[PDB]
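DATA SHEET
Item: assembly model
Revision: 1
Owner: S.N.
Input lines:
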Amino acid sequence: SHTDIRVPDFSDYRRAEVLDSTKSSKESSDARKGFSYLITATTTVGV
Amino acid sequence: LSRFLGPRYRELARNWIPTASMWGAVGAVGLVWATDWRLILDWVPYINGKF
Amino acid sequence: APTLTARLYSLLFRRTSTFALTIAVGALFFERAFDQGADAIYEHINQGKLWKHIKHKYEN
Amino acid sequence: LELHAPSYPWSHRGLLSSLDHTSIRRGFQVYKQVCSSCHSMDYVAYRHLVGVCYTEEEAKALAEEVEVQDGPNEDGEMFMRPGKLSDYFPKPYPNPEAARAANNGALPPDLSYIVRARHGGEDYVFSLLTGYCEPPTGVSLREGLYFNPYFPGQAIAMAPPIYNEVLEFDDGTPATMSQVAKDVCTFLRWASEPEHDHRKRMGLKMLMMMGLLLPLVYAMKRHKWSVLKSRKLAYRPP
Amino acid sequence: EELVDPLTTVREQCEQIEKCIKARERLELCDQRVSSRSQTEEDCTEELFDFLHARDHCVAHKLFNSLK
Amino acid sequence: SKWLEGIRKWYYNAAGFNKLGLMRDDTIYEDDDVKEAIRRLPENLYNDRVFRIKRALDLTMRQQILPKEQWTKYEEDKFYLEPYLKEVIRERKEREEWAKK
Amino acid sequence: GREFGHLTRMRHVITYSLSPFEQRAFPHYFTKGIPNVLRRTRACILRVAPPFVVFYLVYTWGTQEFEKSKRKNPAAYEN
Amino acid sequence: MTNIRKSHPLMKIINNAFIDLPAPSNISSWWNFGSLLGICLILQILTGLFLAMHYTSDTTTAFSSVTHICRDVNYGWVIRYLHANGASMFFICLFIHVGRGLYYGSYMFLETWNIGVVLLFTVMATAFMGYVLPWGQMSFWGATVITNLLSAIPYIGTDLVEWIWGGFSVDKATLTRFFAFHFILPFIITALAAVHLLFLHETGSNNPTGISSDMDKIPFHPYYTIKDILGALFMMLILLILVLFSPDLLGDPDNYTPANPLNTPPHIKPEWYFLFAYAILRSIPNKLGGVLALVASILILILMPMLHTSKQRSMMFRPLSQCLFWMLVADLITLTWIGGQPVEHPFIIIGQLASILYFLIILVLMPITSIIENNLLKW
Amino acid sequence: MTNIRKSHPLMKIINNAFIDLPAPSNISSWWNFGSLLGICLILQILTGLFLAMHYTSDTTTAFSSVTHICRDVNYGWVIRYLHANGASMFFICLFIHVGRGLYYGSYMF
Ligand code: HEC
Ligand code: HEM
Ligand code: HEM
Ligand code: HEM
């Protein structure tokens, strides 16, 4: 009925900070984006 | 290829066999002319004057 | 209390131009440091064999 | 039947090991004093020794020690010149026919790529130089041939070139046959691969860079593909 | 004082080794066979090759320590 | 025939498409006849086939397999596409036989 | 031609996904990969290995036979 | 307003080819090699170009010019050995790509498969002439043998061989011909590869399951651009290992002696990527039969689509066909090994059996096994 | 059924480029040179290639190789002078093409 469909749990994939459902994502958005972009920047430096 | 094993294709071949034979002659004459075979051009009455 | 990665993103990685400037400066300094370290490792492995280790005995 | 050379523990057989430039200098002394009389190294010049085993002034002194034929003068006839580091190592013979005539019809090969031209390389050369032996019963060698078990056919036209005290090293190292053979083989390996040390250094640098990059690019790929690899799909027919 | 090279020492060191010794005795047998006959065509190159292979393997493992 | 049934079951298990939840007719190569047969399938069968194929592709993307009890059982495998494909091939054969005359 | 707008007709399929910045790149990398790698190896080994085992046996036998053929035959020198 | 990436003509072509291309989501790492091939090609051009800036195709200067490249040119050794080992990497990727096509039934793309066969022949010719270029002993004598193979052609063999040679044997004329042809062919290869991708994009790419993947398609760019970059990085790692630690591993030492027309080297064998064909060539005692077998060894790929008798496309669900495929791969490895080995007692018979097995597996065993599998699946 | 010329990919490209391309009915002879340029290009590629089968790029063997082409190679002089004068024809056609573009306002593309 489009209302009995529930998003399946992704907790086994979610990063550590965003695991808690009662804690806002904007708190750690900068940290996660910075981690991924630091990986990207180091890769680009090596390349 | 049993799809083509029919009476119509037998008739179709007979209709195009003369045409295919003519194109084969064009290829044969062309090959002899282009390569100057001279195994065949020796028989040709006027061309055999060369070599 | 933002973490180190959060500070990095806010200062440098958020804007693509600053991202590229950080990449360029890091490329310069990483090239220098990596070349120095790799040369040190290679010369330590081949210590006493290279010309720069024996040239002094023949320099004048 | 043929005999394969053993794998001697050369100091450059390591994954990142370079050459012993002292051994290169000793091997060059061996070359200029022993095999230069019959063998040639066309593709090696004195300038190639400047950054390897001899300083620039020493290389100039080595070059000036041998006369080299120069281009036509005003009269139009060739003359001789003291030599310079731009010159290549002198040819012992003018043409290969002269070399064959002087060596009983056998052409002494050029040693610039010898270690790179023979299977086994420096191992084969070292086993050949030190492997001269009295021919076994049943072997009949033609005149002017010597039995070397490692040379194909076991009948080589090269008389044993090295022996104890064949040359007196400048470095003072004892001039045993094994020492001379090892030094000359190291020098010939340098001649075949003058980029050996630089190639090893670049290989180390590229190994470090690849060890840094491959996990990083792999992490980037995993980051991009996480969307699909965590994707949960459901089928909800009415 | 005659500047004894390590090569002779190492070759002698192998020559007293089970592989070196067995190859040497088989080489001696082949030598006796060839010498005994008058116009035989057989050669001792093969057995010599076996002996030299074993000995030079040992020499490769031992020699370079002594060389400077 | 019992040995034939056993070897058929063994080959069905060996051919690992059941491990992906697929059915036999999902793995068929989509040539012209198969394309037409798929286009003739009723809507429910077509939707089921599409979802099964998509799920199999998702599984193969992650190099994973369906749980042991979710594999398609050999005895409950349905040849849903077979009748439609048989009819399509029969029609093609009839057209070719007419063309032969 | 073939474009994302019109490739196939699909109905009633729901896909849930996550942002790359909300999920871990290597989740349970070893604890799940190693059993999965072992499963794939067990599945594929009986299909892949035997031809290469046969090739290795043939290679060893051929090398041994060639080396034996190069060896001297005593019976040729009986006299 | 509009989007430049979707409207501009060149941008349209590039977007439809590499950015917005619908790609199957389940294609494995075996699909990287295609892109890898392209990279190799690009490399083989760039590197090759920087070898032509110093190489001179004259018998009196070719070997000396190569030694100058590897002795005097700044980083000339890097470029030279990158070229030499990149050719081997190109053929490794070619063999793996053809194996992927055979295994997953990718040959059902008839036009793509045929253009691929043409590409394979062109690359083989380019590599042969490029190997002749250094004018070493190996180059000269391998060229002599391979070109002399053409003399087996009846009634035109001698004339054709002497026309290709530009004389009575392999000499300066042949060397310059080969330099020109080797320079020009890779650009024809690039054009053929463009046509190849054009044909491939007409139906999209296949997938390991062998089932149409239109229900599960992803944009090529975000996923497969980075996946192909990672694959190219791994290929570059392998190539740089070969160029910086064993630059002479896949070569032959006898190619470091200047070509001697009056003295054959101890052994005459071609580069490893040809050995298998060479092995087949040596199985047939007859010269013409050997040449025909060598040609058929590659032309069998043309027959491959017609030999497909199974109801399923990929071999992923055909264990018996998988066993046959791996037997074929082991057989190809055997043929390569024997082509390396001399023509003596065990090698002759093993090579004859291996060639027979290769043709039998590709022609007879595989269709029969596919029919058996079809009967086992009740269709 | 369909038409192979209008359906096959390569045939589609060729048909839309040189077969069914809508072209103005009044373009004068000045619009020939474009195609001529292509012709010239192909010629320079063919002829030049056959010069590369005998030319060596060493200063000690460059002039001698060119004379070898002009004296010894069969019809070598034909190919050499075809190349030399075809470069000049290429530039004549290029200049006429640019002049046509300027005169008829073709630079608006
Ligand atoms: C007596 C003159 C002479 C001397 C001195 C000499 N060589 Fe040679 N060398 C020859 C000749 C002649 C041959 C080839 C003989 C043959 O091919 O039958 C040869 C062959 C060789 C070979 C093997 C070539 C092959 O085809 O296997 C090597 C290696 C070599 N020389 C290196 C050296 C080195 C190193 C030295 C210094 C220790 C040296 N030579 C000194 C004359 C000489
Ligand atoms: C698919 C493309 C190519 C392949 C497979 C290929 C293959 C080869 C091979 C195997 C060699 C032998 C090298 C050696 O043994 O030392 C070679 C040499 C050479 N190639 Fe190519 N090549 C390709 C493209 C090119 C291109 C595009 C050029 C020039 C623009 C070029 C120029 C040369 C030159 C000058 C040599 C001789 C230099 C040398 O041998 O070091 N190659 N090539
Ligand atoms: C220089 C040579 C070649 C180049 C540059 C090249 C390039 C490519 C590329 C980029 C792809 C797409 C990536 C992929 O699907 O893996 C591809 C796919 C393909 N190639 Fe090649 N290729 C070459 C040789 C060959 C050969 C030798 C064959 C067959 C004998 C071949 C047949 C195919 C086929 C059938 C596909 C489609 C595979 C599929 O969709 O499953 N190609 N090629
Ligand atoms: C737009 C294309 C080209 C132009 C405009 C062009 C132009 C020229 C010109 C002006 C010369 C001087 C000839 C002389 O002074 O005698 C020349 C020589 C030469 N070209 Fe071309 N060329 C072109 C393409 C090519 C190509 C594609 C090749 C090889 C594949 C080639 C190979 C040569 C060679 C080997 C020479 C020296 C031979 C000789 O000078 O007789 N050229 N070219």
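QC remark: Residues H 31, 34-35, 37-38, 41, 94, 97-98, 101, 104, 106-107, 109, 112-113, 116-117, 119-120, 123, 189, 193, 196, 200, 205-206, 301 surround protoporphyrin IX containing FE (ligand 3) (CB under 6 Å).
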